[PDB]
Design a protein around this ligand. Sequence first.
Ligand SMILES: [Mg+2]
Ligand SMILES: [Mg+2]
Ligand SMILES: [Mg+2]
Ligand SMILES: [Mg+2]
Ligand SMILES: [Mg+2]
Ligand SMILES: [Mg+2]
Ligand SMILES: [Mg+2]
Ligand SMILES: [Mg+2]
Ligand SMILES: [Mg+2]
Ligand SMILES: [Mg+2]
Ligand SMILES: [Mg+2]
Ligand SMILES: [Mg+2]
Ligand SMILES: [Mg+2]
Ligand SMILES: [Mg+2]
Ligand SMILES: [Mg+2]
Ligand SMILES: [Mg+2]
Ligand SMILES: [Mg+2]
Ligand SMILES: [Mg+2]
Ligand SMILES: [Mg+2]
Ligand SMILES: [Mg+2]
Ligand SMILES: [Mg+2]
Ligand SMILES: [Mg+2]
Ligand SMILES: [Mg+2]
Ligand SMILES: [Mg+2]
Ligand SMILES: [Mg+2]
Ligand SMILES: [Mg+2]
Ligand SMILES: [Mg+2]
Ligand SMILES: [Mg+2]
Ligand SMILES: [Mg+2]
Ligand SMILES: [Mg+2]
Ligand SMILES: [Mg+2]
Ligand SMILES: [Mg+2]
Ligand SMILES: [Mg+2]
Ligand SMILES: [Mg+2]
Ligand SMILES: [Mg+2]
Ligand SMILES: [Mg+2]
Ligand SMILES: [Mg+2]
Ligand SMILES: [Mg+2]
Ligand SMILES: [Mg+2]
Ligand SMILES: [Mg+2]
Ligand SMILES: [Mg+2]
Ligand SMILES: [Mg+2]
Ligand SMILES: [Mg+2]
Ligand SMILES: [Mg+2]
Ligand SMILES: [Mg+2]
Ligand SMILES: [Mg+2]
Ligand SMILES: [Mg+2]
Ligand SMILES: [Mg+2]
Lengths: 14, 239, 95, 158
Amino acid sequence: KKRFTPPIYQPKFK
Amino acid sequence: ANFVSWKSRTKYTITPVKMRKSGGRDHTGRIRVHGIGGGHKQRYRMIDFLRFRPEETKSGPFEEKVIQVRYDPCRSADIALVAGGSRKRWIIATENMQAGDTILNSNHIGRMAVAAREGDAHPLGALPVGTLINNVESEPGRGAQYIRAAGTCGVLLRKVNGTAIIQLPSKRQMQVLETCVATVGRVSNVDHNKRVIGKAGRNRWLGKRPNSGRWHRKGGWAGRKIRPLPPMKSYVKLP
Amino acid sequence: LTYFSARKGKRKTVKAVIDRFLRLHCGLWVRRKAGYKKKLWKKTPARKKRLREFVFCNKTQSKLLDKMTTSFWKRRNWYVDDPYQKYHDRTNLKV
Amino acid sequence: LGQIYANNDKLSKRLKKVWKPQLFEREFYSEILDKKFTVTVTMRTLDLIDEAYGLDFYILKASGEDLCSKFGMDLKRGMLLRLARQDPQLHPEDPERRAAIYDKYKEFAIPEEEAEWVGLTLEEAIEKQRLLEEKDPVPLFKIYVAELIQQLQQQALS
RNA sequence: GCUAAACCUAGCCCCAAACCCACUCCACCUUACUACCAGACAACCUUAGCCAAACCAUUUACCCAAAUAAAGUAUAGGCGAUAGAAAUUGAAACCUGGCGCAAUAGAUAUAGUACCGCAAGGGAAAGAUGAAAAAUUAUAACCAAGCAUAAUAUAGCAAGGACUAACCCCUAUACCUUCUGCAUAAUGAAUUAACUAGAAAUAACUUUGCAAGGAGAGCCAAAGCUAAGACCCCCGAAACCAGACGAGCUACCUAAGAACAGCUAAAAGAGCACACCCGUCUAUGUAGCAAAAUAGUGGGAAGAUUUAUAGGUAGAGGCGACAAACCUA
RNA sequence: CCUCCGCAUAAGCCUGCGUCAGAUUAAAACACUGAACUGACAAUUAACAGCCCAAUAUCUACAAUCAACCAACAAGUCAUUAUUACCCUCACUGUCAACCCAACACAGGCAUGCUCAUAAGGAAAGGUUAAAAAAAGUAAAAGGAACUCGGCAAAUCUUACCCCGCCUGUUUACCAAAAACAUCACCUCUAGCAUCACCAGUAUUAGAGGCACCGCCUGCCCAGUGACACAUGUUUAACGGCCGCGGUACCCUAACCGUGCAAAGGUAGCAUAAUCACUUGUUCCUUAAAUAGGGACCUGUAUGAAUGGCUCCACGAGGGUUCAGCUGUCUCUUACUUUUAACCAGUGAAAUUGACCUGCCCGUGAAGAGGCGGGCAUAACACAGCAAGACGAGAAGACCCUAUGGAGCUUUAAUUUAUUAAUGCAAACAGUAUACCAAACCUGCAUUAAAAAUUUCGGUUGGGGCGACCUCGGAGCAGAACCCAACCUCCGAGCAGUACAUGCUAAGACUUCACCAGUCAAAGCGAACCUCAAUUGAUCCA
Ligand SMILES: [Mg+2]
Ligand SMILES: [Mg+2]
Ligand SMILES: [Mg+2]
Ligand SMILES: [Mg+2]
Ligand SMILES: [Mg+2]
Ligand SMILES: [Mg+2]
Ligand SMILES: [Mg+2]
Ligand SMILES: [Mg+2]
Ligand SMILES: [Mg+2]
Ligand SMILES: [Mg+2]
Ligand SMILES: [Mg+2]
Ligand SMILES: [Mg+2]
Ligand SMILES: [Mg+2]
Ligand SMILES: [Mg+2]
Ligand SMILES: [Mg+2]
Ligand SMILES: [Mg+2]
Ligand SMILES: [Mg+2]
Ligand SMILES: [Mg+2]
Ligand SMILES: [Mg+2]
Ligand SMILES: [Mg+2]
Ligand SMILES: [Mg+2]
Ligand SMILES: [Mg+2]
Ligand SMILES: [Mg+2]
Ligand SMILES: [Mg+2]
Ligand SMILES: [Mg+2]
Ligand SMILES: [Mg+2]
Ligand SMILES: [Mg+2]
Ligand SMILES: [Mg+2]
Ligand SMILES: [Mg+2]
Ligand SMILES: [Mg+2]
Ligand SMILES: [Mg+2]
Ligand SMILES: [Mg+2]
Ligand SMILES: [Mg+2]
Ligand SMILES: [Mg+2]
Ligand SMILES: [Mg+2]
Ligand SMILES: [Mg+2]
Ligand SMILES: [Mg+2]
Ligand SMILES: [Mg+2]
Ligand SMILES: [Mg+2]
Ligand SMILES: [Mg+2]
Ligand SMILES: [Mg+2]
Ligand SMILES: [Mg+2]
Ligand SMILES: [Mg+2]
Ligand SMILES: [Mg+2]
Ligand SMILES: [Mg+2]
Ligand SMILES: [Mg+2]
Ligand SMILES: [Mg+2]
Ligand SMILES: [Mg+2]
C-alpha cells in the first residue's frame, strides 16, 4: 500500500 | 435526531402547504430507501379523495361546478379545484373535464341503473354493467384509495346481492359493498407512459438519485414467472 | 501442574497420575501395560499373560511422577487389608 | 438470563437463552378494598390465590419476599390500614357486612403505628420522615418572652 | 579557564491508630460562570476479551464472608491443560516508624501548567552563595565530554620490543552476536554523567540441635525430624472486546440565500471566453513556500455547477453516479 | 515599476508596529529602532445587526424572469379577518489593529458590494568578480520531427483514417482521472395498500435487479441450482450450456450416409480484433526503406446475438498513424539578462560519524582489500568543478521463504438457529348435536430461505506449488559381532489350509540405538501319550 508516517513535533520548552 | 414531520395541519384548507423533502431519512437518520434525494422544490396540495361528503346542516345531494384545471407535481395526474356551495375542496380531475362543467355528487341508490356522465359520481348500486369507473373505495365512509393515478380506470363485472366486483387495472378481481361511492370515467393526463425523459436532468429535477453502480449477480428471482391469476380478495365482513 | 495457586499458594498434583499409577513407600511406581483388554483375539496367550502383570517404571519416569505429586502421596499408609503391604518396605539392598 | 448449550451437551456451543413467563390479562375483585383491578396475572399467582382461598388472604399471608412487586406491598399496606383504622369500608345502613369482613380478617391486625411503614422503599421512607419532621422554625420572640416571664415569676414569687 | 561539575527541601510509598470533608455576598444546567414566564418523556438488563491447553470450538484463580492443618482430599473437567471446597480442635483488648530514597530516585506534579485535536484524551525538565545581599566582599582553586594556551613534518587498526633523543628498524587483519567459519563490504555504536536487565516450589547438597522420636496443636518416621545456607532475565508486533468522540476537510440529505462580463444567442443539461469548480503535460524542490506549490498548454462556466449559515446518518457500522474511495495530514 | 489588488460586510483569540524609561543582557535570520519586548498611560460612546411579537376561532389556487406581446415546465422565494385586555417608554452586546485556518512573519485556502485600474497598497537588487554546472526568457546560414517508443517545454494555429465509450459529468483527496461508475431507450420480479422516511402516493404507481438511445435482431434448453405452483409442471433479457469418429473423385475448405450421447450439436453477425502461443499471414496502398495505419478471408478447436453482435447524426484532457505549412530534437551549437555561480558581514542547519597518521598493481581470505604477503608510491597545509570506488545517506525489503502470529473476501470446511414469516404440539379464552370449527394478542419444544456468536487452511520438497511419498519387512550400498541414511535399484504386506489344554503359575534374557511396545523359556498343577517375513491401533469414551 501507500506507506507513510507522520512527523512528531517536540514540546515548546526545549 | 430531531426529525419532525411537516404534516402539522389538522384542518382542511385551500392554500398550498409547504412540504419538506426526506431523501430516505426516517426518525433515526440512516438511509433506508435508496434513490430519493435532491430535487426541485414543490408545494403540497391538500387533495380531498372522499367524493361524497355533506356540508354543514346538509344531507341531500348537492351540485358542483368545475372552475379551473391546474397541475399537481406530487403525482402524475393533474388536479382541478371544483367549487360548490360555500366551500372549495380539491378533488382528482377526470378525462374531458374543462372549465364550466357541472358534476353531481349523489348518494340515493335507485331501483334501476343511472346513465350518468363521466364526471359525476354515483354509488355502484346504480351504475350499469360495464362502465369505466375510477377512485373506488373499500369501506363505506372511508375514502377512495384504489385506482387514483393518471388514466387508470376500472370496469364493473357483475353483481350478486349486496356486493360489487370491480375489475382492477392489474387484471385482478376485487369485490366491495354496494353502498360505496365511486367516480365514473377515466382520469385526465393520459399518454403518460409516452412521456420521453430525454436526459438525466429531468430525473434530477424530479428528485431521483441514480441507481447503485455495484454489479449484482442475478439470483433465482430474475427469471420470468408465468403465474395464474391470484384469487379475488374479499373485504365484506361476514359473521 | 501449577507450582503456586491463587488461593493457598501451595503445590497441586495431577489426578491422572494417581488414577493411572500407584506409588510405593520404597520409591517405586506400579503401572499397567496398555492394550491388555482390547483386541485379545489376535494375541498369543503368552502376550496376554505378559500384559496382565504389574510392571514397575524406570528412573526418569519415577522422578517425573514424584515431581508431579506433593508430599501427601509420598507417605506410608497402614491399610487393614492391603495386598501391596509387603511391597512397601524393600529389604536386602546393597547400594 | 442464563445460557443453554446446543444439543444438551457440553461438547458443542454455549448459547444464551432468556425465558419469559406467560401473561394473562385478567380481572380480580378485592373484598377488603371493594374495587376491581386489571392485573396481567400469570399461572403460579393464580394457583397460589386458589390455594390461599381468595386474593386478600394471598396478599396478607405472603411476606415481602414472596410478592416481588410494589403493587402487592401497596395492597398489603392498604388492607392493613383499613383493618387497623376501622374506617368505614362500604357505607352505612348495613354495618353487618363490614363487621363480617372485619371478623373474617382478624388473625393479623397490625397496629396503626407499624402498618404505615410496610412496603415503603428507602427514598419514600426518608421523604415521609422528612415530611413528619418538617416543622417551620418557630420565631425566637415567643421563646424570649416565655423565658422572660418565667424569670420574672421566679424572681417575684420568691 | 571558558563551557560547566557536587552542595537539601517541597516531600514522595507502605504500616499501627483514627472512620474524612464539603455556602463570606452574587452567578452555575439556555451560548454553566446568563435575575425574571404555560406540556410535565428521561435509571431499574447474563459483562466481554487476551492467554494457556503448543491451534481451537468444552475449560482457564479474578467471584470482595480474616489465619492454619485437613488439602491441593473427595470431586468437576475434548477425565486434560487445569479448577477446587465442606464436616472438624482452633483465631490474647491499649503503645507515634522505615537495616526506603533525596529532583533521570521516590506520586506525573512547584502541575494535571505549557503544547496537540472541534472533540474524549495525551501530557513533560524547574528550586543550590551566605549568621548578617540593609556583607554586590574578592576570591579558594584543582577532575569528564568541546575549544585556544601549544596546528601539520614520509609509512600506514594507530600497538608492542627497544636505544642518549617523537619519526626512521622489525612484528602484528577493532569490539559483542545469530554463524563450522565475520574487521570483513552482516548486525549496534560520537562521547560524557544518571538508570536499566536471574524474582521462585517438590525433589536434591552442606552445617547446628534433638532422637525411635522430631516439630510452638495440624505433618513425617523399619534412623528419623527441625532450622539455616544454596536457584532459575530484560526490551521489542500485527490482532479482539467493553465505556465514551467525531460529517466545521471529505460521501449523502434538509430550510432559507448568493454567484455567473462579453460575443455567437438555431429552441438547447449549445460553443469561445472574466471572475469561479477540478487539475492531462512540461520545467523547478523532495529536510522544499507547502507532511502535495508555482504559468500555460487544459474540461465546464444558465446548470447532473459552485458557495456563506444551521441540523442529521459512526465502526457486529455511516455513506457510496462502486474508487473496498472517504469517516480530522 | 507592479496592481491577479485594496476598502467594507461574513467567520475568528481579543489589545497584538501610539507615547514614556530600559534599550547593559535578551527575540530582528545584520543595523537604525521595532509587526518575533518588560512595566505604566487608554482607545472603541450608535442611529449599524441583534436583544422580539397577549390570546380565542377563522381567511390566503391565477409565480419570478423590466412583466406589458408571445411562449412554457423543474408547477414556484413573501398578503388577513371578528372579539377581549393593554395610553409606563429608548435599557443591553462590539465598533482599535498590520488580524483567520495550516507547529512559522509560508509562492496554500476563504463567502458578497464597490472603480475591473483607479483617489487602496508595496519594492525582483547588501556589496564585490563574471569560475564551471543547473533553472527561467529573445533568435539564428541549409533540411523542418530525418533525435527520442511515442509532436516531450516551445511557436505556427492544424486535415483525414481506426478502436472504445451514445453525449454533459464523475471516480482512485496524496504516483493510474481511464475503455472505469452513472445517464434517457429496453427487459425481469414483487405489492390490493392510510399515517414517523417509503407515501400525506395508489398496479399508466412504488420497491428490488441486468445492459444502456435512435437502425437490423435476441434462435434452443429445467438433465444440475434457485424461484413459483405442490396438478411432476412453468421460469433462463434467472445461475449456465449449443459434439466426435468412419466412408467419403484429381488438393485444402466437403455435398451426403452410418454410429453413441445429450437441452441444441455455433443461429445471424464480425474479426487474425483490447481477443491463448503458432501470427513479421495471402495481397494492395501510404515511406526509396514500415511486427507502425486502412481495405476483402477464417483451423475463432479459446469471438459471438441485453457477460448483447455491427455500421450510423454529434462528441471525448481515452488509445494509435498521416497530408499542405512550422519549432535548434540533431548534424553543430551559439550571441545576451535574471535566479544562480566565486569572495566579503552575521543567524545558521539536516542526514551521517567505531577510531584514521586515509595511494597503486599482482596474489589470498566470509568468495569484489587504502589497513594481509611481495613490489611500485611519499615534505606538509586550503580554495574552485565532474562522478570511478568507500557493495555511501533515508525506509529491521513492498519481490522469494518460515511462523500451529493476524486480517479482508467467498462457501456445497466445522458447532448451532441465538432474531423473522410459515408450520405441528401443550396451557389461555367462547359458543357447539358420541364429531368438527382453534379468531386478535403473550409462553416453551423441533424444522425450512437471511444473518450470524468462533476457527483453521499438515509435513520433506538441493528456494515454494505442480512431479513423488506419509506404517512395516527383505535383497546390495553397510562384504566376516552389532548400528547407520538418501527424492539410490527392485519384491511385498492391512492375510491365510486344519485341531481351541490358542489352560493357570513361575527362574533366567534379547529388546529396532530413550520410553511407550514385542519375543524365547527352566519347573509345577492340570492332557492325551501350531506353519509363514511385514501381516497393524495406545489414552478418553461407548
Ligand atoms: Mg435502473
Ligand atoms: Mg450496474
Ligand atoms: Mg492457546
Ligand atoms: Mg470450614
Ligand atoms: Mg521527578
Ligand atoms: Mg516525571
Ligand atoms: Mg577536560
Ligand atoms: Mg611499518
Ligand atoms: Mg559484553
Ligand atoms: Mg540477528
Ligand atoms: Mg551464513
Ligand atoms: Mg562492519
Ligand atoms: Mg542479519
Ligand atoms: Mg551505522
Ligand atoms: Mg455538512
Ligand atoms: Mg459523489
Ligand atoms: Mg452549456
Ligand atoms: Mg464551455
Ligand atoms: Mg471494481
Ligand atoms: Mg472598524
Ligand atoms: Mg505546514
Ligand atoms: Mg500608493
Ligand atoms: Mg546577493
Ligand atoms: Mg535555425
Ligand atoms: Mg523517429
Ligand atoms: Mg505540446
Ligand atoms: Mg465517456
Ligand atoms: Mg490520483
Ligand atoms: Mg476529486
Ligand atoms: Mg492525475
Ligand atoms: Mg458502463
Ligand atoms: Mg439470448
Ligand atoms: Mg492471438
Ligand atoms: Mg513514428
Ligand atoms: Mg468529459
Ligand atoms: Mg559568509
Ligand atoms: Mg581470517
Ligand atoms: Mg583485489
Ligand atoms: Mg572498509
Ligand atoms: Mg527483515
Ligand atoms: Mg510448526
Ligand atoms: Mg494461527
Ligand atoms: Mg488466535
Ligand atoms: Mg476481524
Ligand atoms: Mg512446507
Ligand atoms: Mg524443489
Ligand atoms: Mg533397547
Ligand atoms: Mg514345561
